[PDB]
């Protein structure tokens, strides 16, 4: 039994059913939305810091922590030892993934660049896991439609996101950039960075003078590290205390629309006036993750 799907490398044929899966580099919250944690035998170690992973994975001790590095060679010997039927992986190094795929194990490989693409890739995974994701994907889209409707006619705020260091930002073909855009941010990184995330000189950041700055949830930087950086003292975002760390939500996953909502609410609070934000957040978690009221509580905002 099999199913044909498409990924980064073209058509793939997935043998069914899938018993053991590994998540490398992205999509760590997918098992949470599908209730398939029992099928997971390995996951990139960043995942254990996600709050929906912490809450929904009952036996984290069972799952082998894997590398969260996208560039170095994949650990093919560990992959073979865990005997997965399927490895879902983020392609940060096409050649290294291709190299990895030459060892007898099926890969489903993605490089999600937009929230729209995230949802397509989630649906592809749902085919491999033989789950019906339609209602959950629809909730994701309803939420995107809602944000867009509130931001209609609102002038975007000039901003940028910082990554592991204070001069690494995102540009074209970066899911972070799409998430910023859907949050109502004019990301100046598009002007400087031609693909993914890359460095820029601090003097260009100062010249661009962003009104708001976000920090990648995996970054070691705190908002204070940025606020107190002498290099940034003349920047509007610093002077006006508009520096925010993004929530503990994996970008390539079922909560991407909530990250854009978070950004929109920070950037354009006036756009969300007669909106019951926590009702929206509550129903998002109930539908997407099947949480009950008590379980939803720590995920509500403020
Ligand atoms: N690819 C995801 C997860 C990750 C953790 N470390 C590196 N990447 C991200 O960049 O947000
Ligand atoms: N997810 C990657 C960033 C990236 C986007 N596109 C390619 N790489 C990281 O953790 O750095
Ligand atoms: Ni990454």
UniProtKB/TrEMBL annotation:
The keyword Signal applies. InterPro entries: ABC_Transporter_SBP, ABC_transptr_periplasmic_BD. Keywords: Signal. It comes from the Bacteria. Residues 19-276 form the Fe/B12 periplasmic-binding domain. One of its GO terms (biological process) is cellular response to iron ion. The keyword Signal applies. This is Iron (III) ABC transporter, periplasmic iron-bindin gprotein. It comes from Helicobacter pylori (strain G27).
């Amino acid at each position: 039994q099999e199913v044909k799907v498409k990924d980064y490398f073209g058509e793939q044929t997935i043998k069914l059913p899938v018993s053991k899966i590994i998540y490398l580099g992205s999509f760590a919250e997918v098992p949470a939305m599908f209730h398939t944690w029992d099928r997971v035998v390995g996951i990139s170690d960043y995942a254990f810091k996600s709050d929906i992973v912490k809450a929904t994975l009952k036996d984290p001790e069972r799952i082998k922590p894997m590398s969260s590095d996208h560039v170095a060679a994949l650990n093919v010997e560990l992959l073979k030892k865990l005997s997965p039927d399927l490895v879902v992986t983020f392609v940060g190094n096409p050649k290294a993934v291709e190299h990895a795929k030459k060892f007898g194990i099926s890969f489903l490989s993605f490089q999600e660049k937009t929230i729209a693409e995230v949802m397509e890739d989630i649906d592809t995974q749902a085919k491999a896991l033989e789950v019906d994701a339609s209602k959950k994907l629809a909730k994701m889209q309803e939420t995107l439609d809602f944000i867009a409707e509130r931001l209609k006619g609102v002038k975007k705020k000039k901003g940028v996101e910082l990554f592991h260091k204070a001069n690494k930002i995102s540009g074209h073909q970066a899911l972070d950039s799409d998430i910023l855009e859907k949050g109502g941010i004019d990301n100046f990184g598009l002007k400087y960075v031609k693909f993914g995330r890359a460095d820029i000189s601090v003097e260009k950041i100062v010249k661009e003078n962003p009104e708001i700055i976000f920090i990648w949830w995996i970054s070691p930087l705190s908002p204070e590290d940025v606020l107190n950086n002498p290099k940034f003292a003349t920047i509007k975002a610093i002077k006006n205390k508009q520096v925010y760390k993004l929530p503990t939500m994996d970008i390539g996953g079922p909560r991407a629309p909530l990250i854009s909502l978070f950004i929109a609410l920070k950037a354009h609070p006036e756009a969300f006036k007669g909106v019951d934000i926590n009702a929206i957040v509550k129903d998002y978690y109930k539908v997407v993750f099947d949480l009950n009221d008590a379980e939803v509580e720590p995920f509500l905002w403020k």
